[PDB]
Design a binder for this molecule. Structure first.
Ligand SMILES: CCCCCCCCCCCCCC(=O)OC[C@H](COP(=O)(O)OCC[N+](C)(C)C)OC(=O)CCCCCCCCCCCCC
Ligand SMILES: CCCCCCCCCCCCCC(=O)OC[C@H](COP(=O)(O)OCC[N+](C)(C)C)OC(=O)CCCCCCCCCCCCC
Ligand SMILES: CCCCCCCCCCCCCC(=O)OC[C@H](COP(=O)(O)OCC[N+](C)(C)C)OC(=O)CCCCCCCCCCCCC
Ligand SMILES: CCCCCCCCCCCCCC(=O)OC[C@H](COP(=O)(O)OCC[N+](C)(C)C)OC(=O)CCCCCCCCCCCCC
Ligand SMILES: CCCCCCCCCCCCCC(=O)OC[C@H](COP(=O)(O)OCC[N+](C)(C)C)OC(=O)CCCCCCCCCCCCC
Ligand SMILES: CCCCCCCCCCCCCC(=O)OC[C@H](COP(=O)(O)OCC[N+](C)(C)C)OC(=O)CCCCCCCCCCCCC
Ligand SMILES: CCCCCCCCCCCCCC(=O)OC[C@H](COP(=O)(O)OCC[N+](C)(C)C)OC(=O)CCCCCCCCCCCCC
Ligand SMILES: CCCCCCCCCCCCCC(=O)OC[C@H](COP(=O)(O)OCC[N+](C)(C)C)OC(=O)CCCCCCCCCCCCC
Ligand SMILES: CCCCCCCCCCCCO[C@@H]1O[C@H](CO)[C@@H](O[C@H]2O[C@H](CO)[C@@H](O)[C@H](O)[C@H]2O)[C@H](O)[C@H]1O
Ligand SMILES: CCCCCCCCCCCCO[C@@H]1O[C@H](CO)[C@@H](O[C@H]2O[C@H](CO)[C@@H](O)[C@H](O)[C@H]2O)[C@H](O)[C@H]1O
Ligand SMILES: CCCCCCCCCCCCO[C@@H]1O[C@H](CO)[C@@H](O[C@H]2O[C@H](CO)[C@@H](O)[C@H](O)[C@H]2O)[C@H](O)[C@H]1O
Ligand SMILES: CCCCCCCCCCCCO[C@@H]1O[C@H](CO)[C@@H](O[C@H]2O[C@H](CO)[C@@H](O)[C@H](O)[C@H]2O)[C@H](O)[C@H]1O
Ligand SMILES: CCCCCCCCCCCCO[C@@H]1O[C@H](CO)[C@@H](O[C@H]2O[C@H](CO)[C@@H](O)[C@H](O)[C@H]2O)[C@H](O)[C@H]1O
Ligand SMILES: CCCCCCCCCCCCO[C@@H]1O[C@H](CO)[C@@H](O[C@H]2O[C@H](CO)[C@@H](O)[C@H](O)[C@H]2O)[C@H](O)[C@H]1O
Ligand SMILES: CCCCCCCCCCCCO[C@@H]1O[C@H](CO)[C@@H](O[C@H]2O[C@H](CO)[C@@H](O)[C@H](O)[C@H]2O)[C@H](O)[C@H]1O
Ligand code: NA
Lengths: 225, 225, 225, 225
């Protein structure tokens, strides 16, 4: 009751979240310096223990947050994200987790209010995009299957798999080395390969243009009214 | 009369189109697995016959649809598309048709209502573009002819044909390896080649920008009113 | 007087301009077929004389047009363009003119009304762009001079001239092989070369974005009112 | 008093700033010609002294400007820029300053009113971008650290440093040789490298799209009202 009110008044105070922010920036500087190998021979003893103390502080502070807000902490996406980040950082995963630990720096966007505002502004335009995202995914899946069965035996590196055909169709979509890297080599053996790729590029570019216009008229519809 | 009303009540029922949708997704999974050669040695006997039964079901179900709606089925673009897809899938074409058979997966967009809504939204912005499309096609045709007669003998691979000059001008338009892949090699022998290509890129980029702005002010004109 | 009224009624009749249009499309087909060398061994005798008769018809028909409208023909940009095109096509220029002759196909846009409408729509957005065009040209000129004097001796092919530095800065602007083609080779000898090019790319991209937004708010300003 | 009023009437007269403008354009022509080495053997004696007289004139004329407007000259960004430019041009820096001297040509934008108007129009859209700029910088910093610690030992040239990982992530962002130049070489040894780069590209492209839409709705918000 009084303990609760006092400890919640600590958890949702400014100085608490500010202290967490400043641990975040200091530890961001830390992880920036830890990529330097000469630096690590000299100061690795210190930098590792600094990461240890920040992570215990974070785990304690989500213990307090989750104490204050039991169900609503798990109903809240930002705190859900802080939980899952410190949890990943807490697990001892074949070293692939060491690189995942630096995701804790993303907590900066959850701790600081303006960053939180812009990333929710970013997520909010995604609902309107689901229709075109699914249209494009189906178009890519149908074309990936055709590109695989058309070019897979003679070009195993680029189209031998459904997965590699996704990859290289996605490359083509970004128009990166499309004709010189993939189409023209293909035409040295399959001469009408452009019949598959020119339409692919045209439809993909037009749908991608329509995606971005679709966004604007949404941000404008909330504006003119 | 009563038979008609009963069989039309079956054809335009939800469960019918839903069953067709679920055959579509199952067969999409099927065609996804059929690109895998090891999978096919094991289960090709089954996967081929699954494709056989889905295609007979589709042909039966367009027989029913076309029965219900004789003229209007052929006046309807989505059903016209389903007809032509199953028809392609029904024809025994030098194996080039085997890859065309996976176009049947596109029926998913015609069967499901939201996909149908977004692709007609996509087609509908095309009318407004016809003017600029034809302007660009004429500009490409005039430039393709000049690039052919300017660079064709000394660069047969890139400009020896009107068709190859279309191709490589289209490549340049996507700005993919423009100077490094085509212009600079050309300048090693024809030093003023940039006089042809820099304007080409400028006019092409400006017209393409104007295309996309042209789209927005159309989607906005239906909005502000 | 009556002769005038009758011959002007012929020049500004539909069938006259339509006949000119159909000569244009036939001759476009002609010039398309003339790039084919095997075709020319067979039918070059005919195709050349077809180009001769169309060009005499065009010169006669601008003689009539300029007869009808003396000063205003020269005050009119479309007719100014037809004049200069047939004039180029009439001059016997070291064969560089043979390729310029196909510019006569552009007369199609001047003869047909809808094409004329869209290309003036295209020209009309250019006035608003003069400010940013001149800002960019000054920025390119200042940077081209620095890139020349910084990298010209050790990289004569890319930056040895002010002209070659324009060219390759323009290439960088289109982001085509920027780091792999130019920056990274430069850094193998001049390690801080990115200090010149990263800002260049940032400012160039931001100004180019601002150019395109600048266009939209103009096309919208004529709309919301 | 009277001297002041007379000398301020000279400094803020048109002909004064116009004369400075014409020195600027003449000296721009000069610096354009100075990159030419054959030109310099012939006329370098003259061109260097021309640059000497223009720079003394500029230093005198900012002496007069700063005389007229003591505090407000330093409170004014355009005059602050002219000051710092002539000051750089006045310092005798291991020849790295010789190339910086051509920045004096940028004074043209500060002297001429329309250029001044468009560049402040350009700066003014930057405030609204700070939120997304900082979001992207944090995302790049977190990913640069992961790309360094994931790929640095086996790819020292592209990811051996935090700085080189910034560079090549920025390259990927411009989609320049992404898969062919970096991802596919990486996959020859680290096969799941796309799990790092495909998301990177998706999030980076979406945030960059949102940046540009963010700009438009700002330029439109000042318009519809
Ligand atoms: C919002 C996010 C802001 C991001 C701003 C980023 C500012 C820093 C970017 C770093 C750019 C330079 C990196 C670099 O040059 O790397 C070199 C070293 C590794 O080399 P090293 O092995 O030390 O080689 C020594 C060679 N020697 C003896 C001749 C000197 O590698 C390093 O030493 C890297 C040192 C990085 C310092 C950390 C900077 C933290 C900035 C603030 C981030 C806080 C937000 C979480
Ligand atoms: C986060 C919010 C929404 C995100 C929007 C995108 C959502 C859809 C994402 C794609 C869904 C399909 C994923 C997929 O098919 O994965 C297949 C492959 C498997 O890779 P793999 O076969 O292991 O790679 C081979 C390379 N090797 C052997 C030499 C190592 O892995 C890949 O190659 C994937 C390549 C990129 C595929 C992108 C597909 C784009 C579809 C439409 C995207 C939206 C456009 C607006
Ligand atoms: C709206 C459209 C949604 C699209 C979502 C796409 C999700 C699936 C993307 C597939 C990405 C991965 C593809 C891939 O990795 O290919 C590998 C195999 C071929 O290799 P394989 O010859 O089996 O090599 C065996 C090697 N061994 C023995 C060591 C294991 O190739 C395969 O096995 C591919 C298996 C694909 C499964 C089908 C997935 C269907 C997803 C739902 C689509 C329904 C809408 C029509
Ligand atoms: C679906 C809705 C509307 C679509 C908008 C585009 C409509 C216009 C499409 C193009 C019309 C002209 C087609 C054409 O000229 O085809 C010529 C070539 C023939 O190829 P080919 O000579 O067999 O290729 C040689 C390569 N080889 C020998 C080594 C195998 O084949 C090609 O290389 C074609 C290359 C692409 C040409 C694109 C022309 C773009 C014009 C404006 C496009 C619209 C921009 C908004
Ligand atoms: C608004 C503008 C519309 C533009 C639509 C463009 C439609 C035509 C695009 C041409 C695409 C194909 C070009 C092509 O494949 O070139 C091959 C030949 C040159 O090869 P050739 O030397 O004949 O080799 C013979 C080989 N052999 C004996 C085994 C057959 O090269 C040719 O034969 C080219 C023939 C082109 C025919 C002219 C088409 C005119 C279309 C309408 C344009 C009118 C508007 C002015
Ligand atoms: C039509 C309506 C308005 C058009 C907007 C653009 C207006 C401004 C155009 C550029 C003005 C300056 C032209 C210029 O500086 O020409 C220099 C070079 C000379 O070439 P050169 O030195 O012969 O090339 C060397 C290659 N080699 C020896 C191996 C054969 O030739 C080039 O390399 C030129 C390269 C492209 C320069 C583009 C400069 C862009 C400035 C801002 C463009 C507008 C962005 C919105
Ligand atoms: C708003 C900004 C407007 C910018 C407009 C730019 C117009 C000029 C662009 C220059 C493009 C051509 C550059 C070029 O071709 O470079 C060649 C020479 C260096 O070669 P060089 O060593 O002379 O070789 C001689 C070879 N020989 C004996 C056989 C003739 O290199 C040169 O001679 C370059 C000469 C450039 C002349 C200066 C042009 C000033 C234009 C107005 C700028 C005023 C605003 C500040
Ligand atoms: C002017 C108004 C606002 C401007 C917007 C951008 C503001 C943020 C800029 C970037 C801040 C971080 C700078 C940084 O981390 O510098 C690190 C490296 C150090 O280079 P270094 O390690 O010496 O390069 C190695 C190459 N070598 C050894 C072979 C010579 O140097 C680099 O490689 C930098 C590479 C480009 C980094 C761009 C980061 C973009 C973040 C978001 C950009 C805004 C997107 C809208
Ligand atoms: C919504 C729009 C949908 C657009 C869909 C378009 C699909 C069209 C795909 C075109 C694919 C072209 O791929 C085509 O494959 C066949 C099948 O082997 C090749 O066929 C042949 O190739 C060469 C011929 O010199 C030989 O090695 C061999 O005799 C044979 O395999 C064709 O020469 C090639 O051009
Ligand atoms: C709406 C805008 C329209 C823009 C249209 C612009 C068209 C301009 C095209 C410029 C083309 C340049 O192409 C030009 O071709 C001629 C004709 O052989 C070459 O001429 C020469 O090339 C080299 C010279 O070293 C020699 O091999 C040879 O003696 C000769 O063929 C020129 O050196 C080349 O620079
Ligand atoms: C069936 C679909 C209907 C077809 C019509 C749809 C449009 C298709 C256009 C062809 C696709 C290739 O698209 C190519 O993309 C590149 C991207 O670098 C464009 O380059 C772009 O540069 C600027 C700067 O970003 C853009 O504002 C502009 O849209 C475009 O000019 C090429 O100018 C464009 O041609
Ligand atoms: C509006 C924004 C304006 C932005 C303007 C930015 C301009 C900055 C330009 C940075 C250019 C870097 O170019 C720099 O040139 C000098 C001058 O030789 C090189 O200096 C040195 O290079 C290498 C060093 O290993 C040696 O061969 C040699 O001893 C020497 O020439 C630098 O190492 C290089 O990094
Ligand atoms: C006669 C025509 C009038 C000439 C003026 C018309 C504009 C011409 C611009 C030069 C054309 C090259 O166009 C080049 O396209 C590339 C596409 O990757 C742009 O790169 C682009 O990145 C972003 C992200 O998409 C775009 O929002 C932006 O438009 C542009 O900066 C280059 O910045 C631009 O310069
Ligand atoms: C907001 C979104 C955030 C997205 C973040 C995504 C991060 C995911 C990064 C995936 C990185 C893949 O990088 C992965 O690195 C490990 C660690 O060595 C490699 O592991 C192995 O590589 C090869 C295996 O043949 C061998 O040389 C060796 O035995 C081993 O090092 C993996 O095979 C590689 O695929
Ligand atoms: C001082 C200036 C202020 C700096 C901020 C201005 C923005 C600078 C951004 C960095 C420039 C590189 O710009 C790079 O252009 C490429 C063009 O292929 C973009 O790729 C683009 O793809 C799509 C499709 O066209 C565009 O709608 C979008 O704008 C962008 O994501 C990269 O995502 C972008 O990062
Ligand atoms: Na490229």
């Amino acid at each position: 009751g009084s303990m609760y009110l006092r400890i919640t008044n600590i958890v949702e105070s400014s100085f608490f979240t500010k202290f967490i922010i400043y641990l975040i920036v200091l530890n961001g500087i830390t992880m920036g310096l830890e990529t330097s190998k000469t630096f690590m021979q000299s100061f690795g003893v210190y930098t590792t223990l600094f990461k240890q103390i920040v992570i215990t502080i974070f785990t304690i502070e989500i213990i307090l947050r989750i104490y204050v807000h039991r169900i609503s902490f798990f109903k809240d996406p930002w705190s859900l994200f802080d939980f899952f980040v410190v949890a990943i950082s807490l697990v001892p995963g074949f070293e692939i987790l060491r690189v995942l630990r630096v995701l804790r720096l993303f907590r900066l966007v959850t701790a600081v209010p303006q960053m939180r505002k812009i990333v929710s502004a970013l997520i909010s335009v995604i609902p309107g995009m689901l229709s075109v995202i699914a249209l494009m995914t189906l178009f890519f899946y149908i074309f990936a299957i055709m590109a695989t069965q058309l070019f897979g035996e003679r070009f195993p590196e680029w189209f031998g798999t459904l997965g590699e055909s996704f990859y290289t169709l996605f490359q083509v979509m970004t128009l990166e080395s499309w004709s010189m890297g993939i189409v023209r080599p293909l035409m040295e053996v399959y001469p009408y390969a452009w019949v598959f790729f020119i339409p692919f590029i045209f439809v993909v570019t037009f749908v991608m243009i329509n995606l971005v216009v679709a966004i604007i008229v949404d941000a404008m519809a909330i504006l003119n009214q």
